[PDB]
């Protein structure tokens, strides 16, 4: 019960890493605000997670909030306060990676990736931190960045800057919000088999090349990110802020 | 003559680091395209630099190009090809840092910082890389990032993500453009006394705190970045791509 | 019970970060091997920790093992197998930092710092990894590195290379041992008020300079590292290997 | 003539990266002290380089100095002062990497790698910096570290800590020696085809895997490191200290 009586907001929590984090936080005692994109599949996934959490004795609510809408942060916080009376943890997880080459990158596709992954995160973090500061009990903010915050991707020239920007946002927010006991950290998943790279890793030569580079011998799954996220949200991480935590089975270090 | 016959574009080169970099590139034999913001001061400063360069026997032109206008990249490249027949080096330097607290950051100021520093850089790099690819001669791209791509700033939560983003962009572009011999690197200046921090360091307590943290015992000046940029643009760096270079007098490493 | 039934070795655990880490590991259900330096104070402190652990219902033993003696690794492992029948976690914590200027560093002091902090750690990791490999159950190795693996210290030119070395050792061991399910990570404490810096921070000007640089507003205490070490040793971190975790209150990121 | 009238010492300069750096520094005007191991091949290679430098109008001398002998630093400095009256640049390049697995790593092989690569470097840097400080004209120190200071190697568990330690030594020495105008930086070669990895890359499956990961499409050669080293030794790098410079053709960043 590492998160008992904490209100946790998770953005883009209908599937993948965010769904697994939302589910494990509820298992750890937290009252979970399941943020979703507002699409048909997003809403359906958030409600089925809320149903699942209800089934094992936890509390959760679903709240639509398009991350590219810079006003959805305050919507999430308002709903969290209505249902649960506080905001104590923000897991900023919503993000997209539409694989695309650099020289013909459309302006709209680039702007949508920065808008969803970084700009919307900035103002979602801003709204949650505002509430945490008003409450005066401290707080915990976790950004789902990437190994690709540290290294490049040829088909991700529009995406890796948003993941690096998210990490840097956590570093700067750690200074700004430290005096209020609000801890700001980034988690950096490696290659996690999810919808975001289902088509990409359908190329079995690329899948094998990537898997061979993982010392632990497997790609990740969403639950691999739940423990790290719960840790960073918990009192186990009471002196951890401004930090980066790679969760990649050793992918980053494996040069030879 | 480290850059003899090369055509170099420098964005935002009317003053500061960009002015010093364009000046030294022309001293090294380059034909320089002095890009500027299109404002009155930017026009005047670009034109006086062109006057100065022609005086000591170089060639240069001044070209207005708002970095926040995502179409200025193709305009700078077109002016470069029209004048000098090639684009061989891009120094992406234009940038703003309007210091501002985090919790009351207005969306317009945030969006202009990301648009100028990161989005405009993306499409300027794209335009210049497209031309370098067509020529078949390789090339060099240098982004002026910052020490603040590695560490935070409480009044720079909107700014440090753009500097981290630029660094990550060089890393991903290094991969996408490597097959075409286009090297992409970031230079990370420390605290350089320029217009961007004139007001900020007018507080003498912060000025001493920052200065006494520099092992070399002084803040930087624009000419301190000219050597490292020329190096990265030159054949001295033929095997350097996807790299970061701190030019900060030791400021980053100095904990105690 | 995050570590229930696991056998944990902590080196240098008579005081400081190691003492707090061994205590919390036993609180989490682990059978702890409290390694110590073999000195009189180290023996006494290890024995009183064993007394305290048995008191609240845990199991532990005290084992003398000079980290600078490169054969103590096999001695710690042998004592662990003899007492508890397995080795499942190694927390390599033993270390010295005799502050000293660079240009007059004596070879004996340099060589003892590298021998204790790095060489002894290498062969302790080797002994413990050999046993984990034989068992076929996986395992976890955590090296106590430092923020000073990322930044410099003028009176620590002999010390920071050992902390950087430990981090790099975890990265390379993560690759070599990944196929055997042994995860290797570094934890990077910031400025933790302990015996190692009691004299150094007795200068109140440096103490304030360091403290005011911590966004969380305080220096750390040994218990601040217990949570992060337990996390890295637990199944919460099943996909974490070859990673670094700053536990520093934001000190690393705080430039301005 | 970036290094005219500077005395440059290069350790382990009989072949590979160090030979190419020694040769290019002499082409840039410097008076070069060609340090070598003192073996038969080391001495023969240093004299043939000195002969080559004589042939194109430069000045150089050969000086035997086993890097694992902690007293050879002062021997190098004494000889540099005798011949050329000053020490102005130190390129610490001597190093070994005897590929070997971790679990059966012999103690002697480990201690020889740390002794040659890190401990000997510490006291060679110490001797050169002592002379530079006495002279009062500033100086430049460059350590040849590695990409493997940033990432792991399964057969390099004994070696990557020495490369990371060298980088960290430069960071700490930058603080300690900054007030004397002595700049301390690390260069990080990627995979450079030399004697150190001739046997390793004779496995063409490993060679192809490594080469495919290089965006620039080739492994390095020694001359690829000469420009970066000359840059860091020159006034072009006047504000560069405590820095790391990757020279790897994009190897590090190329995840996908
Ligand atoms: N899977 C990996 O390998 C990997 C690695 C590193 C980082 N990440 C990051 O993990 C995070 C989650 O991605 P994932 O791997 O679980 O893949 P995913 O596609 O399964 O999940 C993406 C989540 O974000 C939601 N989302 C998308 N756009 C949204 C919007 N405008 N507003 C609100 N929610 C939105 C999605 O509906 C979904 O729930 C992303 O930020 C991604 O950048 C993934
Ligand atoms: N001064 C430092 O300490 C420091 C440190 C690291 C990085 N940087 C970066 O260096 C670069 C140059 O900054 P500086 O220190 O010379 O300050 P500066 O304000 O004196 O120069 C900024 C330049 O960018 C131009 N510019 C601003 N907006 C523009 C726009 N929309 N379009 C085109 N040009 C525009 C400006 O006209 C100016 O010439 C910036 O990107 C900055 O982020 C500065
Ligand atoms: N205190 C900090 O700010 C800080 C920050 C980062 C890393 N560290 C590292 O944390 C670890 C513990 O340091 P601490 O802060 O608790 O200081 P400490 O001096 O109180 O504890 C050091 C422990 O290591 C033991 N030890 C010393 N030499 C030994 C030897 N040859 N053999 C076996 N044990 C030996 C000591 O007996 C002691 O228990 C060290 O490795 C240190 O480098 C400390
Ligand atoms: N080749 C690469 O891929 C690569 C990559 C990164 C870093 N490095 C580093 O580059 C440096 C030079 O290695 P290299 O690639 O040129 O291979 P190399 O084997 O051809 O050169 C090694 C040099 O160091 C000398 N040397 C060895 N032991 C010595 C000793 N005790 N005393 C004095 N000199 C000694 C050698 O005689 C030789 O001149 C090393 O420090 C290496 O760790 C190499
Ligand atoms: C799409 C996804 O993005 C992640 O940040 C990482 O780069 C993974 O490798 C990729 O599969
Ligand atoms: C989802 C769950 O998360 C927990 O932290 C646990 O320790 C495991 O890591 C994982 O199975
Ligand atoms: C505005 C300028 O931005 C730089 O990136 C760095 O943070 C400097 O310290 C600051 O003065
Ligand atoms: C502007 C000029 O740039 C050159 O590279 C030179 O070496 C110096 O660093 C500086 O004065
Ligand atoms: C001795 C101790 O070492 C740590 O690694 C860090 O540098 C702390 O600041 C110092 O107090
Ligand atoms: C020692 C203990 O460790 C636990 O992880 C807990 O969460 C706290 O951080 C600390 O008080
Ligand atoms: C031996 C040599 O060592 C270098 O540091 C690097 O790791 C290269 O890949 C390797 O070939
Ligand atoms: C050895 C020589 O070094 C110089 O700096 C030159 O620019 C090239 O990089 C290389 O051919």
Displacement of CA D196 from its chain's centroid (Å) = 13
C-beta of A97 in contact with ligand 5 (< 6 A): yes
Nearest 5°: phi and psi at B181?
65, 25
In whole angstroms, what is the distance from residue A114 CA to residue A157 CA? Answer: 11
Residue of B86, B145, B163, B234 marked active site:
B163
Interhelix angle A160-177/B160-177, nearest 10 degrees:
160
What Å distances lie between residue D13 and A252, C70, C116, D24, CA to CA?
32, 33, 32, 12
Q: Which pair of tokens denotes residue D55?
A: 């042939």
Our CA-based measurement puts residue C14 at a distance from the nearest CA of chain B, in whole angstroms, of 27
In whole angstroms, what is the distance from residue B159 CA to residue D187 CA? Answer: 29
Residues D10/D35, Cβ–Cβ less than 8 Å: yes
Displacement of CA A208 from its chain's centroid (Å) = 26
Helix (H) or strand (E) holding A122: helix A120-135
Q: Which pair of tokens denotes residue A17?
A: 């890493």
Helix (H) or strand (E) holding A161: helix A160-177
In whole angstroms, what is the distance from residue D79 CA to residue D73 CA? Answer: 10
Interface of C with D in 227-256 (CB under 8 A): 242
User: What's C117's DSSP letter?
Assistant: I
In whole angstroms, what is the distance from residue B117 CA to residue A57 CA? Answer: 48
Displacement of CA D127 from its chain's centroid (Å) = 16
In whole angstroms, what is the distance from residue A210 CA to residue A208 CA? Answer: 5
User: What's B237's DSSP letter?
Assistant: G
Strand positions, DSSP E, A52-158: 59-64, 89-92, 139-144
Q: Does C151 touch chain A (CB under 8 A)?
A: no
Nearest 5°: phi and psi at C32?
-105, 135
- Give the residue before each break in chain C, using a C-to-N cut-off of over 2.5 angstroms; say none if it is continuous: none
Residue A47: CB atoms within 10 Å: 16
Its domain, for residue B178, covers 1-256
What value, to the nearest 5°, has the Cα angle with vertex A125 and ends A122 and A129?
140
Paired strand residues for C62: C34
Q: Which residue of B has its CA nearest to C152?
A: B253
Atom index in ligand 11 nearest the CA of residue D153 equals: 7
Ligand with the closest atom to the CA of D197:
11
Q: Which residue of D has its CA nearest to C100?
A: D176
At residue B89, the 3 state secondary structure works out as strand
* Binding residue numbers of D: 12, 14-15, 17, 37, 66-67, 93, 146, 148, 156, 159, 163, 191-192, 197
In whole angstroms, what is the distance from residue D192 CA to residue B184 CA? Answer: 20
Contacts of D214 in chain B (CB under 8 A): 178
Q: How much distance in Å is there from the Cα of B104 to the middle of ligand 2?
A: 24
In whole angstroms, what is the distance from residue C31 CA to residue C23 CA? Answer: 10
Length of chain D: 256
User: What's C112's DSSP letter?
Assistant: H
At how many Å resolution was this determined? 1.6
Helix, strand, coil shares of chain A, percent, nearest 5, are 50, 15, 35
Helix (H) or strand (E) holding A230: helix A226-233
Q: Which residue of D has its CA nearest to B1?
A: D1
Using alpha carbons, select from A119, A139, A148, A28 the residue that is nearest to residue A77.
A139
Using alpha carbons, select from B80, B133, B59, B88 the residue that is nearest to residue B233.
B88
Using alpha carbons, select from D95, D239, D76, D74 the residue that is nearest to residue D162.
D95
Q: Is B130 exposed, middle or buried (0-12, 13-18, 19+ CB in 10 A)?
A: middle
In whole angstroms, what is the distance from residue D170 CA to residue D122 CA? Answer: 10
In whole angstroms, what is the distance from residue B148 CA to residue B169 CA? Answer: 15
What Å distances lie between residue B47 and B35, B124, B195, C191, CA to CA?
10, 21, 19, 51
- Find where tokens 């921070």 sit: C201
The runs of H, that is alpha helices, within chain D are 16-27, 40-55, 72-84, 107-114, 120-135, 160-177, 204-212, 226-233
Contacts of C152 in chain B (CB under 8 A): 250, 253-255
Interface of A with B in 4-63 (CB under 8 A): none
DSSP string, D160-180: HHHHHHHHHHHHHHHHHHGGG
Helix (H) or strand (E) holding A89: strand A89-92
DSSP string, D196-249: GGTTGGGSHHHHHHHHHT-TTSS-B-GGGGHHHHHHHHSGGGTT--S-EEEEST
Q: Which residues of C172-202 are buried (b: 16+ CB within 10 A; e: fewer)?
A: bbbbbbbebbbbbbbbbbbbbbbebbeebbe
Q: Which pair of tokens denotes residue C78?
A: 């042998």
Residue of B159, B198, B202, B239 marked active site:
B159
Interhelix angle B107-114/B160-177, nearest 10 degrees:
30
Contacts of C153 in chain B (CB under 8 A): 255-256
* Binding residue numbers of B for NADP(+): 12, 14-15, 17, 37, 66-67, 93, 159, 163, 192
- Rounding to the nearest 10 degrees, give the CA dihedral for residues C67, C72, C75, C80: 20
Using alpha carbons, select from A212, D129, D253 the residue that is nearest to residue B184.
D253
Residues A184/A173, Cβ–Cβ less than 8 Å: yes
Q: Which pair of tokens denotes residue D99?
A: 């590929």
Please name the chains neighbouring C, where neighbouring means 3+ C-beta pairs under 8 angstroms: A, B, D
Nearest 5°: phi and psi at B200?
-60, -40
In whole angstroms, what is the distance from residue D194 CA to residue C91 CA? Answer: 38
Residues A188/A246, Cβ–Cβ less than 8 Å: yes
Q: Which pair of tokens denotes residue A220?
A: 């990740």
- Find where tokens 């930017």 sit: B42
Catalytic residues of D: 146, 159, 163
In whole angstroms, what is the distance from residue B199 CA to residue B197 CA? Answer: 6
* Binding residue numbers of D for beta-L-rhamnose: 146, 148, 156, 159, 191, 197
- Rounding to the nearest 10 degrees, give the CA dihedral for residues B153, A179, A225, A252: 30
At residue A162, the 3 state secondary structure works out as helix
Q: Which pair of tokens denotes residue B64?
A: 């207005």
Contacts of D154 in chain A (CB under 8 A): 256
Residues C233/C141, Cβ–Cβ less than 8 Å: no
In whole angstroms, what is the distance from residue C34 CA to residue A207 CA? Answer: 43
Measured distance between the N- and C-terminal CA atoms of chain D, rounded to whole angstroms: 40
Residue C1: CB atoms within 10 Å: 10
Q: Total structural domains in chain C?
A: 1
Residue B196: CB atoms within 10 Å: 18
In whole angstroms, what is the distance from residue B209 CA to residue B213 CA? Answer: 6
Residue B205: CB atoms within 10 Å: 7
Using alpha carbons, select from B252, B149, B88 the residue that is nearest to residue C150.
B252
Using alpha carbons, select from C195, C193, C196 the residue that is nearest to residue C207.
C193
Helix (H) or strand (E) holding C140: strand C139-144
Catalytic residues of A: 146, 159, 163
Our CA-based measurement puts residue A90 at a distance from the nearest CA of chain D, in whole angstroms, of 29
In whole angstroms, what is the distance from residue A126 CA to residue C156 CA? Answer: 39
Residues A81/A63, Cβ–Cβ less than 8 Å: no
Residues A97/A113, Cβ–Cβ less than 8 Å: yes
**B212: Cβ contacts below 8 Å, ≥ 6 apart:** none
Q: Which pair of tokens denotes residue A208?
A: 């094998």
Contacts of D153 in chain A (CB under 8 A): 255-256
The ligand 7 site (C-beta within 6 Å) comprises: B 97, 146-148, 153, 163, 191, 196-197, 200; C 256
Q: Which pair of tokens denotes residue B87?
A: 């684009």
In whole angstroms, what is the distance from residue A76 CA to residue A96 CA? Answer: 19
Helix (H) or strand (E) holding B64: strand B59-64
Helix (H) or strand (E) holding C19: helix C16-27
Task: Give the CA diameter of chain D.
Answer: 52
Strands D59-64 and D89-92, sheet pairing = unpaired
What value, to the nearest 5°, has the Cα angle with vertex C52 and ends C49 and C54?
110
Residue B202: CB atoms within 10 Å: 9
What Å distances lie between residue B191 and A149, B110, B121, CA to CA?
24, 22, 21
Q: Is A51 exposed, middle or buried (0-12, 13-18, 19+ CB in 10 A)?
A: exposed
Contacts of C154 in chain B (CB under 8 A): 256
In whole angstroms, what is the distance from residue B217 CA to residue A118 CA? Answer: 36
Atom index in ligand 10 nearest the CA of residue C230 equals: 5
What Å distances lie between residue A12 and A111, A143, A159, CA to CA?
19, 12, 17
Using alpha carbons, select from C120, C237, C139, C241 the residue that is nearest to residue C180.
C139
Length of chain C: 256
Residues C208/A212, Cβ–Cβ less than 8 Å: no
Q: Which residues of A68-91 are buried (b: 16+ CB within 10 A; e: fewer)?
A: bbbebbbbbbebbbebbebbbbbb
Q: Which pair of tokens denotes residue A128?
A: 């949650």
**Cβ contact C215–A239 (<8 Å):** no
Q: Does B103 touch chain A (CB under 8 A)?
A: yes
At residue B9, the 3 state secondary structure works out as strand
User: What's B137's DSSP letter?
Assistant: S
Residues D98/D70, Cβ–Cβ less than 8 Å: no
Paired strand residues for C183: C140
Interface of A with D in 155-194 (CB under 8 A): 155-156
Using alpha carbons, select from A215, A223, A220, A197 the residue that is nearest to residue A251.
A215
In whole angstroms, what is the distance from residue B97 CA to residue B117 CA? Answer: 9
In whole angstroms, what is the distance from residue C87 CA to residue C214 CA? Answer: 37
Residue C167: CB atoms within 10 Å: 26
Paired strand residues for C201: none
Our CA-based measurement puts residue C204 at a distance from the nearest CA of chain A, in whole angstroms, of 21
Ligand with the closest atom to the CA of B113:
2
Strands B31-36 and B7-10, sheet pairing = parallel
Strands B182-189 and B139-144, sheet pairing = parallel
**Cβ contact C165–D165 (<8 Å):** yes
C-beta of C97 in contact with ligand 3 (< 6 A): yes
In whole angstroms, what is the distance from residue B185 CA to residue B168 CA? Answer: 10
Helix (H) or strand (E) holding B166: helix B160-177
- Sign of CA pseudo-dihedral D74, D78, D80, D86: positive
Residues D151/D188, Cβ–Cβ less than 8 Å: no
Q: Which pair of tokens denotes residue D180?
A: 């004397």
In whole angstroms, what is the distance from residue C161 CA to residue D57 CA? Answer: 40
In whole angstroms, what is the distance from residue D111 CA to residue D106 CA? Answer: 9
Q: Does D148 touch chain A (CB under 8 A)?
A: yes
At residue A207, the 3 state secondary structure works out as helix
- Sign of CA pseudo-dihedral B54, B58, B59, B62: negative
Q: Which residues of D154-177 are buried (b: 16+ CB within 10 A; e: fewer)?
A: bbbbbbbbbbbbbbbbbbbbbbbb
Q: Does B73 touch chain A (CB under 8 A)?
A: no
Using alpha carbons, select from B76, B78, B58 the residue that is nearest to residue B67.
B76
Residue with CA closest to ligand 6 atom 3: A227
* Binding residue numbers of A: 12, 14-15, 17, 37, 66-67, 93, 146, 148, 156, 159, 163, 191-192, 197
Paired strand residues for D31: D7, D59
Residue C86: CB atoms within 10 Å: 19
- Find where tokens 């009062």 sit: D136
**C23: Cβ contacts below 8 Å, ≥ 6 apart:** C49, C52, C53, C226
């Amino acid at each position: 019960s590492l998160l008992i009586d904490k209100t946790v907001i998770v953005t883009g929590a209908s599937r993948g890493i965010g769904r697994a984090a939302a589910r494990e936080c509820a298992r750890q005692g937290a009252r979970v605000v399941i943020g979703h994109s507002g699409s048909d599949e997003g809403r359906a996934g958030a409600l089925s997670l809320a149903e699942e959490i209800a089934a094992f004795g936890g509390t959760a609510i679903a709240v639509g909030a398009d991350a590219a809408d810079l006003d959805s942060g305050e919507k999430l916080v308002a709903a969290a306060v209505e249902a649960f009376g506080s905001v104590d943890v923000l897991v900023n997880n919503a993000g997209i990676c539409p694989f695309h080459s650099f020289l013909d990158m459309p302006r709209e596709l680039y702007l949508k990736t920065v808008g969803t992954n970084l700009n919307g995160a900035y103002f979602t973090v801003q709204a949650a931190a505002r509430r945490m500061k008003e409450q005066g009990r401290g707080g915990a903010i976790i950004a789902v960045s990437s190994i690709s915050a540290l290294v490049g991707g040829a088909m991700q020239t529009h995406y890796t800057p948003t993941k690096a920007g998210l990490l840097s946002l956590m570093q700067s927010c750690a200074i700004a919000l430290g005096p209020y006991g609000i801890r700001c950290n980034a988690v950096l998943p490696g290659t996690i088999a999810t919808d975001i790279n289902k088509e990409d890793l359908s190329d079995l030569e690329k899948r094998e090349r990537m898997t061979s580079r993982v010392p632990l011998g497997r790609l990740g799954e969403p639950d691999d990110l739940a423990g790290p996220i719960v840790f960073l949200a918990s009192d186990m991480a009471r002196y951890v802020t401004g930090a980066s935590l790679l969760v990649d089975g050793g992918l980053f270090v494996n040069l030879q």
